[PDB]
Amino acid sequence: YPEYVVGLQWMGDNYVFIEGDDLVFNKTTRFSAADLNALMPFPSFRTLDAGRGLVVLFTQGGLVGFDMLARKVTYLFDTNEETASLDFSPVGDRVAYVRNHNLYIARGGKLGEGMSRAIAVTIDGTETLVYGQAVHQREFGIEKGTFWSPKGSCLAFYRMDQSMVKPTPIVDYHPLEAESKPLYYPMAGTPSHHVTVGIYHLATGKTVYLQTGEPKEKFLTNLSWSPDENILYVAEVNRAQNECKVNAYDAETGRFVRTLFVETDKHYVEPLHPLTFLPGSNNQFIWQSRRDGWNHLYLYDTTGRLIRQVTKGEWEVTNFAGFDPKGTRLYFESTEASPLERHFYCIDIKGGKTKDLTPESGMHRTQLSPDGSAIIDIFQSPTVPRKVTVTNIGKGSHTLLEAKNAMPEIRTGTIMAADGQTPLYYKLTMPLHFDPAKKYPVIVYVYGGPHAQLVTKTWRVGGWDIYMAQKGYAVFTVDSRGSANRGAAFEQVIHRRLGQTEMADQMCGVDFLKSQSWVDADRIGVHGWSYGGFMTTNLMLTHGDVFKVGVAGGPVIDWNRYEIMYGERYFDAPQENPEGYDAANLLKRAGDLKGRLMLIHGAIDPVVVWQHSLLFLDACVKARTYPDYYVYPSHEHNVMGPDRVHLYETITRYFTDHL
Amino acid sequence: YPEYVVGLQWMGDNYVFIEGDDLVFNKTTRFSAADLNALMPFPSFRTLDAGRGLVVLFTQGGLVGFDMLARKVTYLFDTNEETASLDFSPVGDRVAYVRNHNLYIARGGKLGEGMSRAIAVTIDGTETLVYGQAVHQREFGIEKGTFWSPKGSCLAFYRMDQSMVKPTPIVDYHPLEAESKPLYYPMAGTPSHHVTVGIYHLATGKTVYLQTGEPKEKFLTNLSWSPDENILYVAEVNRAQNECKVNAYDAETGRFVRTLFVETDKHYVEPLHPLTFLPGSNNQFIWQSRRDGWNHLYLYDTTGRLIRQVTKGEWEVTNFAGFDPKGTRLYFESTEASPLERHFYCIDIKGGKTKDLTPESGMHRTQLSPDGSAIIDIFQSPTVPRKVTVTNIGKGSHTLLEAKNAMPEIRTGTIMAADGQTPLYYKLTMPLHFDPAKKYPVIVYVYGGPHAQLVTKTWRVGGWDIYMAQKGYAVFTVDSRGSANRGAAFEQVIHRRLGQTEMADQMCGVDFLKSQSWVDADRIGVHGWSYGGFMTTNLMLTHGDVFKVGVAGGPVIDWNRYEIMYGERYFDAPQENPEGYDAANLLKRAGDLKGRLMLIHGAIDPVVVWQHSLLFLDACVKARTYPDYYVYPSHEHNVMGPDRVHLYETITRYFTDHL
Ligand SMILES: *[B]([O])([O])[C]1[C][C][C]N1C(=O)[C]([N]C(=O)[C]([C])[N])[C]([C])[C][C]
Ligand SMILES: *[B]([O])([O])[C]1[C][C][C]N1C(=O)[C]([N]C(=O)[C]([C])[N])[C]([C])[C][C]
């Protein structure tokens, strides 16, 4: 992004993209918005079924399903205005959605055959009882709360009772009188919500619940249906997050059938992906697992027997793309070439050697065709803005677009972590018009938390580094330990001790900066958002002689006030780890603020609740220290859209005023 | 304040004060804390009855009534920990208070005679139904909600149904999860709360309500009992606030008896004081009124006939102190000598000439003895820090304490208002070490709203001006039109047009500043709190070429979000005055912010709700302008106590950084 070839994707055996008013098909044909409009009763659509080229069009009056290969309307759907929770049946003729707390199924209507009223699956949804939506704070790969069986006979869905969770107020300041709504945000160490899984059987209109049993707090993750629809598999994770049991439940009655396998960890287990069945098989599936230190693909049968670890090595699978039609090969993205890069690979289901299908050094983003016969590859590197190719697998490529190259120079390299052994990768955005004779102020842009990696081999953070460098400030970033795509041992060093290693590694970044002659060692600043706001603030309080100025956005300040699921994975529960929580609790060290720090929060932030930065200002008042503040009353966790211009101006002016 | 002679006051025919461990009596005797302690079953006390020297002591285990003239314990009271709402019977042997939403009366227990359970006057108090407390947002002189009859036979009290008022959330951020409480703050133009007056008769335990009738929104103010306890008088003010009817109600049945008199005004009527009966009379009383342009004392009889305007002139009575024993003279404080000064006077009840009893130029604060025979006077002026005298009236004074005089020079003078006719008084705090050869930045400290007057002839704002001047910044203040103690016409020019005249007068202040050679006209700032925060912000947006930097604390930003009672008096209702509200609505002009402005708010401010400054930051985001912010999460409208040091440091550093 930015997208040079709009909507580039597979439809049947054609790759497809938009060109203003046309939709262009190739294996060439065009389809105009006028051609299309004539068929209604180039616009935006959601692809439902790439293999069959079925999409849905969001229009003036409900949804219009459309077949792009046949060039024919499929169904019109009426979801009473609901679009966010839309989940279409794999059969393509029904859609589940949530409206006013309850789960519904709507049936599509064929062109001029009249409509039917939607079915209410649930009727007692409310504030404290949530149906059909993501649960467990969207941890464990959970992004939604509806799971159609693969032949469309059944709809599994979450039911979340959060009546035992003490809510946080989220205040809307726009009405005449401000209006508060409870957010049922379960904080570390507190009673969790109670999720159960229902299955609604369309033929009979019966609902059964899985008998997942006790404890009621157990995390029910990665729902995966058997291809024959008889079993619903669930990866269940305990409160300690050190055990994951993959269990089979009977879809008809809800009864527990068997435990397939159990994974455990010294620190935490974290399942993130569903079971994926082999093509044409009801008995074998791929499961992703980081159990050996590295995310890899495992071949299981459905009794729970492990056939083979299919991928292996000191590198990680970062996206599983699927199979060849016969199910004899796996396709996937990984870090095998470099953790700074992403390539697409093939491997035999029997394992052994990977074959890189996108060998150019840099970042490949790749889409395997419904065939399993070809790929779209989108490529960028420090020297290549965008290279979009289409390859018939092992039959030569065809380039579809290639982009050609005063701006800030970007330098990259490696420094040693604080253990003196682990290498860390860094990027350094140099002042515009950099003159090596001169001294320059510099800003550490830090994130440093799990699941993110900021330094990759890409077409050279959303460009805040560039803007700052245009103002004469170098910006440095290093992926310290805790960060992603470097295997588990590299990440899990932070367990029970948030901030400690991360800061020690960032101070290696500062040691490097200070080795540079052109760095003004007395003008070093720090900026980050979220976990990076936690880090910015911790760094100013911990290394006040070094960091003169920071801006911390949406910062975690007190981890006891972060959510149970993410928080307790990396930190354990507060009652189990008082020493670690206390060391990371920035409220306790507010008196050590001696530089200039601005905190920024969205007022309606439901991720890092506003309370975090407010209590920090409060602690500073008592401690007699002097931070600055800005609040975005209409924003949540991140400032999004045009208002991001105001954000960038506020942050950079703070630095140009004070650093 | 600071208090040089601690607790200085009348007790019987003695004036009294504390000296560490003694309470010293004079007309000399001492009473030690050890003498006192021996009598319990020099400390802090509340005087209940100065004439009889009866006080109450707040102790470890309930309240102890004590007679200071007799040196004997009166009663012990058990009010289950409640102290804020305490209202003692004039008989001295019972106390009303509010606990858990309900009104109670407790009977005092004589030393070693055992206690009795308190009487519950009400039992259905809750969140939306308030008993025994101030109502109508404490406007109209209302400071409490209990009114004992003067012989203690009855207790009148307010009942406020606020179930029709849409509340504002007030959030406590200190618990693990933040906790919101509704504040039933009725905003301009919205449905007001419904107040009725109950009277509880102690002999029978019966409660009757006054039949105050419709509209239910009417303001019931300045409750005043007849000395014979048969009638309860109420000053009733309509929603428009341009009519006040003083009505008599039968205390026994609640029935309406008669309207005594009606006052009306072109702009607003504002009754602020109770009826005060002549000594020994049930038929004549003094009523304060600003009806002729100036606050004066009127002599009425109880049918409603006006006997005489007793005081008159182009000056205002600022405190009515009472009568001589015979009720032939009035004692009171006024502005007759100068609006910049306060003197104590005598006048014949027949009127005519005032006699100044405290003729020295400056500020006198005066207490008339229970006799009506003598005064304590506390005096300060620009040259006199503190002069404390005691005069036997018209029989020569006795001085009791006289205080003796690098610091910022304070200059004072007069400039013309923007009409070119009305004089305005100003004070100017000069930089420390002021050098007339030099140029200095200067800050307008502005308040500018009704009911306040910042420039008086005093021992030279809580000293923020001095601190700023120590940092090299001159501070200027001018009492613009709208401000207090200059009669109604001077105030009421702002009616329906908040900010407009006030700003035009403050810009005369700036014209004066710019006439000074030692003023750096390019380094002019502005600071104020509350109405002064409204003014600071309006000035920056209205005169952005002049005011480079401001700090606005607890600012009103949108008057539609200010309370019905204060707001609609000066502005009328929003539906009646859209042009005036729109002109004062700072949200509409956020795009005109071109200087540096910090807003500061207490998060739990129940006067100017936090929403005001938050919506201003929000409007600035949209408008692309760049204010700064600080929030005090544990503070209400003003930052109080030691945290005020943090406040002063934040505000002054903002100026030293940017102005
Ligand atoms: B942030 O860094 O954006 C925020 C605070 C620390 C972790 N975090 C997250 O947003 C994580 N998500 C969740 O906590 C979800 C909402 N449970 C991110 C980084 C994904 C792991
Ligand atoms: B402030 O100036 O402290 C605030 C905003 C404008 C008026 N105001 C007040 O505090 C007034 N009191 C009330 O509004 C009461 C609470 N109804 C003061 C100035 C007394 C008139």
Beta strand segments in B543-652, E: 547-553, 596-602, 628-632
Same domain, B635 and B539: yes
By DSSP bridging, strand B72-77 and strand B62-67 are antiparallel
Taking CA atoms, B248 is separated from A488, B131, B230, B308, in Å, by 83, 22, 10, 21
Buried-exposed string A245-262: b where 16+ CB fall within 10 A, e elsewhere: bbbbbbbeebeebeebbe
Query: Is A5 touching ligand 1 by the criterion CB < 6 Å?
Result: no
Tokens describing residue B506: 């403050």
Long-range contacts of B354-357 (CB under 8 A, 24+ apart): B354/B311, B357/B391, B357/B393
Contact criterion met (CB below 8 Å) for B659 and B525: yes
Residue type, B177: E
Same domain, A437 and A379: no
Edge-to-edge strand ranges of the sheet holding A256-264: A219-225, A231-237, A243-250, A256-264
Q: Which residue of A lies nearest to B172 if distances are taken between CA atoms?
A: A611
Same domain, B287 and B435: no
Judging contacts by C-beta atoms under 8 Å, the chain B residues touching residue A653 are: 626
Q: Which of B405, B422, B438 is the last residue of a domain?
A: B405
Taking CA atoms, B198 is separated from B18, B154, B156, B218, in Å, by 40, 10, 6, 15
Same domain, A259 and A278: yes
Look up tokens 């009383």; give the residue: B285
Interface test with B, best of A164, A172, A177 (most B CBs within 10 A): A177
Residues 6+ apart with CB under 8 A from B158: B130, B131, B132, B133, B134, B135, B145, B195, B196, B197, B198, B220
DSSP state of B575: G
Helix, strand, coil percentages (3-state) for chain A, rounded to 5, are 15, 40, 45
CATH of the domain at A150: 2.140.10.30
Residues pairing with B410 in the sheet: B429
- CA of residue B493 relative to chain centroid, distance: 22
Alpha carbon distance B386, B383 (integer Å): 9
- CA angle centred on A534, ends A528 and A537, rounded to 5°: 80
Interface test with B, best of A621, A645, A650 (most B CBs within 10 A): A621
> Domain count of chain B?
2
Same domain, A310 and A348: yes
Ligand 1 atom closest to residue A451's alpha carbon, by position in its atom list: 21
B621 → closest Cβ in A167, A179, A632: A632
Instruction: Supply the DSSP string of B496-543, one letter for each residue.
Output: T-TTHHHHHHHHHHHHHHHHSTTEEEEEEEEEEETHHHHHHHHHHHHS
Contact criterion met (CB below 8 Å) for B653 and B623: no
By DSSP bridging, strand A231-237 and strand B22-26 are unpaired
Same domain, B204 and B332: yes
Nearest to B363 by CA among B339, B347, B391, B346: B339
Same domain, B410 and B326: no
DSSP state of B59: E
- Mutual orientation of helices A611-623 and B643-658 as an angle, nearest 10°? 100
Q: Which of A359, A378, A405 is the last residue of a domain?
A: A405
Ligand 1 atom closest to residue A531's alpha carbon, by position in its atom list: 2
Tokens describing residue B337: 């000598």
Q: Which residue of B lies nearest to A629 if distances are taken between CA atoms?
A: B629
Alpha carbon distance B242, A395 (integer Å): 91
Cis peptide before A41 (omega within 30 of 0): no
Does B178 contact A653 at a Cβ distance shorter than 8 Å? no
Residues 6+ apart with CB under 8 A from A469: A408, A429, A430, A431, A432, A475
Tokens describing residue B305: 């006939």
Give the number of beta-carbon pairs within 8 Å between A and B.
Answer: 111
Alpha carbon distance B104, B131 (integer Å): 10
Same domain, B214 and B245: yes
- CA angle centred on B409, ends B404 and B415, rounded to 5°: 120
Instruction: Supply the DSSP string of B284-320, one letter for each residue.
Output: EEEEEE-TTSS-EEEEEETTS-EEEE-S-SSS-EEEE
Same domain, B467 and B363: no
Ligand 1 atom closest to residue A607's alpha carbon, by position in its atom list: 16
Tokens describing residue A191: 């009673």
By DSSP bridging, strand A474-478 and strand A440-445 are parallel
Query: Which residues form the domain of B472?
Result: 406-659
Instruction: Supply the DSSP string of A322-337, one letter for each residue.
Output: EE-TTS-EEEEEESSS
Our mutation pick for probing the ligand 2 site, out of B219, B557, B566, counting the most ligand atoms within 8 A of Cβ, is B566
The three-class DSSP label of residue B217 is coil
Show which of residues 177-216 on chain A sit within 8 Å of chain B, judged by CB atoms: 177-180, 185, 187, 190
Tokens describing residue A609: 């609740």
Same domain, B396 and B411: no
Closest C-alpha residue for ligand 2 atom 7: B531
Alpha carbon distance B597, B550 (integer Å): 5
Closest C-alpha residue for ligand 1 atom 13: A566
Buried-exposed string A134-150: b where 16+ CB fall within 10 A, e elsewhere: bbbbebbebebbbbbbe
Backbone φ, ψ for residue A523 (5° rounding): -120, 55
Number of other CB atoms surrounding residue A52 within 10 Å: 17
Contact criterion met (CB below 8 Å) for A337 and A357: no
Contact criterion met (CB below 8 Å) for B262 and B291: no
Contact criterion met (CB below 8 Å) for A615 and A601: no
Cis peptide before A215 (omega within 30 of 0): yes
Q: Which of B385, B405, B425 is the last residue of a domain?
A: B405
- A487: CA distance to ligand 1 center in Å? 19
Look up tokens 């030279």; give the residue: B460
- CA angle centred on B356, ends B354 and B358, rounded to 5°: 160
Q: Does B617 touch chain A (CB under 8 A)?
A: yes
Same domain, B381 and B439: no
Determine the distance in angstroms separating the CA of B650 from the nearest CA of chain A, rounded to an integer. Answer: 7
- B296: CA distance to ligand 2 center in Å? 24
Residue type, B416: M
Determine the distance in angstroms separating the CA of B167 from the nearest CA of chain A, rounded to an integer. Answer: 7
Answer positive or negative: Cα dihedral of B561, B565, B569, B574. Answer: positive
Judging contacts by C-beta atoms under 8 Å, the chain A residues touching residue B167 are: 177
Judging contacts by C-beta atoms under 8 Å, the chain A residues touching residue B603 are: 614
Q: Does A348 touch chain B (CB under 8 A)?
A: no
Closest C-alpha residue for ligand 1 atom 7: A531
Our mutation pick for probing the ligand 2 site, out of B534, B607, B613, counting the most ligand atoms within 8 A of Cβ, is B607
Ligand 2 atom closest to residue B607's alpha carbon, by position in its atom list: 16
The three-class DSSP label of residue A8 is coil
Contact criterion met (CB below 8 Å) for A622 and A616: no
CATH of the domain at B649: 3.40.50.1820
Edge-to-edge strand ranges of the sheet holding A317-323: A317-323, A329-334, A343-348, A355-356
Alpha carbon distance A377, A331 (integer Å): 13
Taking CA atoms, A18 is separated from A24, A402, B215, B351, in Å, by 6, 17, 67, 94
Look up tokens 């935490």; give the residue: A268
Same domain, A177 and A238: yes
Query: Is B188 touching ligand 2 by the criterion CB < 6 Å?
Result: no
